[PDB]
């Protein structure tokens, strides 16, 4: 038997509300003006480079802010486009 292996991914926080955050996962960090785009516009510009992270399981997300680069941990991705996952932990990079 071995320890529970969790998945992880890195991305930049572009939108954050009390229930979820939208992360961009392109190599380069989003440009300053990408932070005035709507969710619909982000979906178009960063197609296949977006992840939605559900924050219901995190005790406090006050420090999870737009512009932060983070690593998130989760068990599995939901069957969605963009992919989405309920995260168990995050780390500010």
mmCIF file of C-alpha atoms in Angstrom, residues 4-86:
data_model
loop_
_atom_site.group_PDB
_atom_site.id
_atom_site.type_symbol
_atom_site.label_atom_id
_atom_site.label_comp_id
_atom_site.label_asym_id
_atom_site.label_seq_id
_atom_site.Cartn_x
_atom_site.Cartn_y
_atom_site.Cartn_z
ATOM 1 C CA UNK A 4 -2.857 8.831 -1.802
ATOM 2 C CA UNK A 5 -1.297 10.371 -4.944
ATOM 3 C CA UNK A 6 -2.879 13.778 -5.757
ATOM 4 C CA UNK A 7 -2.610 15.550 -9.082
ATOM 5 C CA UNK A 8 -1.384 19.096 -9.428
ATOM 6 C CA UNK A 9 -1.213 21.921 -11.939
ATOM 7 C CA UNK A 10 0.087 25.474 -12.141
ATOM 8 C CA UNK A 11 -1.730 28.527 -13.394
ATOM 9 C CA UNK A 12 -2.383 32.221 -12.980
ATOM 10 C CA UNK A 13 -5.512 33.492 -11.203
ATOM 11 C CA UNK A 14 -7.486 35.703 -13.660
ATOM 12 C CA UNK A 15 -10.926 35.614 -11.941
ATOM 13 C CA UNK A 16 -11.788 34.706 -8.344
ATOM 14 C CA UNK A 17 -15.099 34.724 -6.497
ATOM 15 C CA UNK A 18 -16.143 32.954 -3.298
ATOM 16 C CA UNK A 19 -16.861 29.611 -5.052
ATOM 17 C CA UNK A 20 -14.278 29.289 -7.811
ATOM 18 C CA UNK A 21 -11.208 30.690 -9.469
ATOM 19 C CA UNK A 22 -10.383 30.724 -13.190
ATOM 20 C CA UNK A 23 -6.747 29.905 -13.919
ATOM 21 C CA UNK A 24 -4.812 30.531 -17.123
ATOM 22 C CA UNK A 25 -2.250 27.785 -17.839
ATOM 23 C CA UNK A 26 -0.280 29.194 -20.794
ATOM 24 C CA UNK A 27 3.580 29.391 -20.342
ATOM 25 C CA UNK A 28 3.747 33.174 -20.120
ATOM 26 C CA UNK A 29 1.792 35.013 -17.409
ATOM 27 C CA UNK A 30 -1.331 36.888 -18.654
ATOM 28 C CA UNK A 31 -0.709 40.463 -19.757
ATOM 29 C CA UNK A 32 -2.017 43.328 -17.631
ATOM 30 C CA UNK A 33 -5.014 43.933 -19.995
ATOM 31 C CA UNK A 34 -6.107 40.275 -19.828
ATOM 32 C CA UNK A 35 -7.467 41.251 -16.343
ATOM 33 C CA UNK A 36 -10.189 43.471 -17.930
ATOM 34 C CA UNK A 37 -11.526 40.636 -20.132
ATOM 35 C CA UNK A 38 -14.876 39.041 -19.429
ATOM 36 C CA UNK A 39 -15.129 35.361 -18.633
ATOM 37 C CA UNK A 40 -16.484 34.850 -22.193
ATOM 38 C CA UNK A 41 -13.523 36.695 -23.716
ATOM 39 C CA UNK A 42 -11.047 34.700 -21.590
ATOM 40 C CA UNK A 43 -12.779 31.460 -22.741
ATOM 41 C CA UNK A 44 -12.126 32.543 -26.372
ATOM 42 C CA UNK A 45 -8.555 33.879 -25.976
ATOM 43 C CA UNK A 46 -7.179 31.096 -23.716
ATOM 44 C CA UNK A 47 -9.122 28.119 -25.228
ATOM 45 C CA UNK A 48 -7.584 24.799 -23.984
ATOM 46 C CA UNK A 49 -5.375 26.889 -21.588
ATOM 47 C CA UNK A 50 -8.010 27.485 -18.830
ATOM 48 C CA UNK A 51 -8.842 25.544 -15.679
ATOM 49 C CA UNK A 52 -11.739 26.248 -13.321
ATOM 50 C CA UNK A 53 -10.908 25.411 -9.692
ATOM 51 C CA UNK A 54 -13.712 24.955 -7.185
ATOM 52 C CA UNK A 55 -12.830 26.434 -3.767
ATOM 53 C CA UNK A 56 -15.627 24.857 -1.568
ATOM 54 C CA UNK A 57 -13.114 22.640 0.274
ATOM 55 C CA UNK A 58 -10.553 25.383 1.116
ATOM 56 C CA UNK A 59 -11.049 26.838 4.627
ATOM 57 C CA UNK A 60 -9.943 30.416 3.723
ATOM 58 C CA UNK A 61 -9.188 31.862 0.254
ATOM 59 C CA UNK A 62 -8.578 35.545 1.179
ATOM 60 C CA UNK A 63 -4.986 35.409 -0.219
ATOM 61 C CA UNK A 64 -6.122 33.794 -3.519
ATOM 62 C CA UNK A 65 -6.152 36.967 -5.632
ATOM 63 C CA UNK A 66 -6.079 37.938 -9.291
ATOM 64 C CA UNK A 67 -2.570 37.949 -10.670
ATOM 65 C CA UNK A 68 -1.228 35.297 -8.314
ATOM 66 C CA UNK A 69 0.609 32.328 -9.821
ATOM 67 C CA UNK A 70 -0.405 29.182 -7.924
ATOM 68 C CA UNK A 71 -0.015 25.433 -7.771
ATOM 69 C CA UNK A 72 -3.250 23.540 -6.975
ATOM 70 C CA UNK A 73 -3.759 19.945 -5.799
ATOM 71 C CA UNK A 74 -6.776 17.795 -6.613
ATOM 72 C CA UNK A 75 -7.877 14.177 -7.013
ATOM 73 C CA UNK A 76 -9.489 14.327 -10.490
ATOM 74 C CA UNK A 77 -10.679 16.589 -13.277
ATOM 75 C CA UNK A 78 -14.362 16.805 -14.003
ATOM 76 C CA UNK A 79 -15.536 15.955 -17.523
ATOM 77 C CA UNK A 80 -15.883 19.544 -18.634
ATOM 78 C CA UNK A 81 -14.451 21.983 -21.191
ATOM 79 C CA UNK A 82 -12.613 23.883 -19.811
ATOM 80 C CA UNK A 83 -11.536 21.235 -17.315
ATOM 81 C CA UNK A 84 -12.554 21.848 -13.756
ATOM 82 C CA UNK A 85 -11.621 20.393 -10.411
ATOM 83 C CA UNK A 86 -12.447 20.707 -6.724
#
